[PDB]
Structures are given as C-alpha cells and as structure tokens.
Amino acid sequence: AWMYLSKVIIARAWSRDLYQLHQGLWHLFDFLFHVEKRNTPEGCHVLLQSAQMPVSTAVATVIKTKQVEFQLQVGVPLYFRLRANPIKTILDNQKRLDSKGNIKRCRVPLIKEAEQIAWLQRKLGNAARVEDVHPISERPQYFSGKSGKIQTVCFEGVLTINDAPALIDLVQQGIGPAKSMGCGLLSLAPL
RNA sequence: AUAAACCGGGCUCCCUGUCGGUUGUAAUUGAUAAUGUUGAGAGUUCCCCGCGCCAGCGGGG
C-alpha cells in the first residue's frame, strides 16, 4: 500500500510528442502519470506516481518528491481527478482485416456524457460511489515507430469510498486503457 | 629539324621622425478601428497479447 509521488518536468526538447514523454519518464527509474501543463517554455509539467524513486536527468527534471502510504477510511467522501479514455471495442465496419486473417477490431471512444459517467462508475465498481462528476472534454491526442490517436476525458468530482483496499489498488494499478500516454492516474483529495 | 640550333639580365637597398577636429541646438501641435456571427454534428482509434457467451471486456504500446 505504498508509493512515490513526484512533480516532474520534461524539457520541451523531448516533450514534443507523447512517445518521448513516456520515454523521458521511463529513463528516470512501472508507474502512472497525469499531464498538468503540456507545453510551457521550460517544457512539460507532469504529476507522477510510481513504485521506484525517480532521479533527475538531462531531459526530465525532478522538482519535488515524497513517499506515501495510503490510509483511507471507508465512508469518507473525497474529491477526485482522473484522466482516462472511455472506449467500446467493436469489429471494423470498414471490414478491414487482422494479421491472422479475419476482420479487425477497433477501439472507438464513447462520445456521450452519460456513457462516460456510466463508464466511470462501472470501472471503479464497488470500490467507491461517484456522488458528483464533471466530464471535462479534451482535444484528441495523436502520436508518432508506431502511430495513432486516443480520445481522453478528464473526470473531476466527488466520490464516496466503499471498500478502501479495493480503491487503493485501483489507484495503484490505474483505470482504463492507454496508461502509458497520460491516462490511468487517479488522484484523491480530502473534502 | 625554320636567321634555325645550343641559349638566366643578373647581384645590393627602413620612407623615416612631430600632430584634440573642437565650441553651440524641443521634432513639435491634431486623431473611435468601428458595425455583424451556434461549433454544430459525429462512438474509427493505428499495433501486440489474454479472456470471450462473438454483445464485447481487460492488459501492454
């Protein structure tokens, strides 16, 4: 039930695209992160939960850092923040084809607010109950030796805890696809 | 293989010493950038793997 929480910046040099953000992060030490200021002159402000202590490098400067244990009392309401990409997985309507030889599957984003909220309450399950949520819409992110696109949503709001351990390893494992591209990290805060 | 052939114009040498370009000088008065406008709609998001009851669900990029 332990972790390392850090405030990390990545020089705008490498931070030009997601792939190099995740790279720059890897070279500090798995882990999870939330982008807080994507493109400043100094570079890119990122919050970082991890299992290992980070050590500042030429590309990714560690501002401040501290180690944390989780003690959450069930029944207590909390503020939360989560950046993630709600999806549905279907079979291609373009009827494109897989490598093995039958048709491809595609992850499409959920584009209705109700569906997104639903997706949230679903994924956190009986760990907590969302009491108040606002599903912040974000501009799509692309990435470039692979290449594609992911559509994120940023939930902020108020949950009530129902099962502390469950919730805790939700926090430590992450919620939703695309963990290595800014998603997953759930941050909690006292009411 | 020609008024041709063979066939050096060649040796020595400070241009040197002296020298304020200097005093004086508002660029200054006048001047709306102003009228008019849903961002709406839309689940395609590219690769690997697991589970699938083929509705999809999940892990990793």
UniProtKB/Swiss-Prot annotation:
Q: How is the cofactor bound?
A: Does not require a metal cofactor.
| SMART domains cross-referenced by the UniProt entry | CRISPR_assoc
Q: Which GO terms describe its biological process?
A: CRISPR-cas system; defense response to virus; RNA processing
Xref: InterPro entries: CRISPR-assoc_prot_Cse3 (IPR010179)
State the SUPFAM superfamilies in the record.
CRISPR-associated protein (SSF117987)
> Does the entry feature the keyword Nuclease, yes or no?
yes
Q: Which UniProt keywords apply?
A: Antiviral defense, Endonuclease, Hydrolase, Nuclease, RNA-binding
**What Pfam families does the database record attribute to this sequence?**
CRISPR_assoc
EC number assigned by the record: 3.1.-.-
Name the top EC class: hydrolase
Q: Effect of knocking it out?
A: Loss of resistance to bacteriophage lambda infection, loss of plasmid silencing. Decreased levels of crRNA, increased levels of pre-crRNA, prevents pre-crRNA cleavage.
Q: What induces it?
A: Repressed by H-NS, activated by LeuO. Activated by the BaeSR two-component regulatory system, possibly due to envelope stress. Part of the casABCDE-ygbT-ygbF operon.
GO CC, sorted alphabetically, is:
protein-containing complex
Q: Which cysteines are joined by disulfide bonds?
A: none
Mention one GO molecular function.
RNA binding
| Assembly and interaction partners | Part of the Cascade ribonucleoprotein complex, with stoichiometry CasA(1),CasB(2),CasC(6),CasD(1),CasE(1)-crRNA(1). Interacts directly with crRNA, CasA, CasB and CasC. Stable subcomplexes of CasBCDE-crRNA and CasCDE-crRNA also form, both of which are able to bind target dsDNA, and CasCDE is able to form R-loops. CasCDE and CasCE complexes have endonuclease activity. Interacts with YgbT (Cas1). Binding of target ssRNA or dsDNA causes a conformational change in the Cascade complex.
Q: What does this protein do?
A: CRISPR (clustered regularly interspaced short palindromic repeat), is an adaptive immune system that provides protection against mobile genetic elements (viruses, transposable elements and conjugative plasmids). CRISPR clusters contain sequences complementary to antecedent mobile elements and target invading nucleic acids. CRISPR clusters are transcribed and processed into CRISPR RNA (crRNA). CasE is required to process the pre-crRNA into single repeat-spacer units, with an 8-nt 5'-repeat DNA tag that may help other proteins recognize the crRNA. This subunit alone will cleave pre-crRNA, as will CasCDE or CasCE; cleavage does not require divalent metals or ATP. CasCDE alone is also able to form R-loops. Partially inhibits the cleavage of Holliday junctions by YgbT (Cas1). Yields a 5'-hydroxy group and a 2',3'-cyclic phosphate terminus.
Family as reported in the entry's similarity comment: Belongs to the CRISPR-associated protein Cas6/Cse3/CasE family. Subtype I-E/Ecoli subfamily.
- Name it: CRISPR system Cascade subunit CasE
Organism of derivation:
Escherichia coli (strain K12)
